[PDB]
Curated annotation (Swiss-Prot), chain B:
This is Zinc metalloprotease MJ0392. The chain holds residues 3 to 218 of 339 of the full protein. It is a multi-pass membrane protein. It is found in: Cell membrane. Inhibited by 1,10-phenanthroline. GO terms for biological process: proteolysis.
Length: 218, 216
């Protein structure tokens, strides 16, 4: 159950229940206390997320418009697609990080010649920063971050799709575990919570790929 | 210890064993098959790391400027320095990743309108990708990648340098090890190799006192 919002660049943008309930809790927590910008941030963040998962989309269309919808799950955003070529990945993958990087580098320059001050925080400036992280972070050569499909790509035709998958996927698992060890060691929920997303995000890849391979190898 | 190479702008530039071992693996890999590429890459990487360690430098000179040495790793650079002005951390740390990032994003675009083919291998394109990974990789909160000098900072104020360094550095050794077990267990040299760079990278950052010698 998603809720229509509006279509941009010819792609349906939806809001998942999980995202709405999540948003509602945020909007509410932006009133139970005066955490004003916290709510606005969440909004900017996901607006930015939209665009990132849009660039990803575009470069993809120019390969097979399996792009039906685009729903925002509280953990970022997912662009509902279908079959994805193995010789188009490397592009579709970096596609999104470019967009959010460019957007971030521009809004960054401009947010030094003009911006909007809300209780001080310069929306323009703030954003560029986020886009920059969203751009750069999605480049760590690991899974589920774009840099994972990208690293697999560069590797694929040399280590075989499954092994080259496993490497990316393995490093995720690697990073996640360590992240956990310290989120669990300093008892800092968010660290922990994120370590789990990343990790099961990497594993969900080995599983499917792997299962698949076995099925192809008859 | 490492091996002297050459200096620039009055700063000694060295090459940690990390790069020698990595060199060695590449030289050997260029005999495993009729390479050109593996040698090419080592050069591209090296060049890209230099630039990464240059951005780190610039933003630094516009501050404390305390740049005495520069150790280069295929991962990044453990540019040995001292006092770090307030806001030089956060900045000097991300300074390098941005360079590596922009350089990578630029050459990436360009390498779709023009390139240089060496026995096939497209130099510009290749490059962009290394800088992108080299940029993105250094965002992992551990040593010696840049995401550690920055994690130390955010942490520092609540634990203090001496042990606040150990923490990040410890995170590295721990991360490394695990990664090793993976590379070791799946016989994937790459994991293994990086696993080593990382580790000895933490061993070399987790230092606090170093007694050298000089012959000028
Ligand atoms: Zn993405
Ligand atoms: Zn660096």
């Amino acid at each position: 159950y998603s809720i229509r919002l509006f279509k941009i660049m010819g792609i349906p943008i939806e809001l998942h229940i999980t995202f709405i309930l999540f948003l509602v809790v945020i909007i509410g927590l932006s009133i139970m206390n005066n955490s004003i910008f916290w709510a606005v941030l969440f909004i900017l963040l996901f607006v930015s997320v939209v665009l990132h998962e849009l660039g990803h989309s575009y470069v993809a269309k120019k390969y097979g418009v399996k792009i039906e919808k685009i729903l925002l799950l509280p953990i970022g955003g997912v662009a509902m697609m279908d079959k994805i070529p193995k010789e188009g990945e490397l592009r579709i993958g970096i596609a999104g990080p470019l967009v959010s990087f460019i957007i971030g580098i521009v809004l960054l320059i401009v947010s030094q010649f003009f911006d909007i001050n809300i209780n001080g925080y310069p929306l323009l400036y703030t954003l560029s920063l986020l886009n920059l992280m969203l751009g750069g972070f999605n480049l760590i050569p690991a899974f589920p971050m774009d840099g994972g499909r990208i690293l697999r790509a560069i590797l694929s035709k040399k280590y075989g799709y499954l092994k080259s998958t496993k490497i990316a996927a393995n490093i995720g698992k690697s990073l996640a575990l360590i992240m956990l060890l310290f989120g669990l060691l300093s008892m800092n929920i968010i660290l922990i919570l994120v370590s789990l997303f990343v990790y099961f995000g990497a594993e969900q890849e080995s599983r499917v790929v792997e299962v698949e391979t076995i099925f192809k190898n008859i």
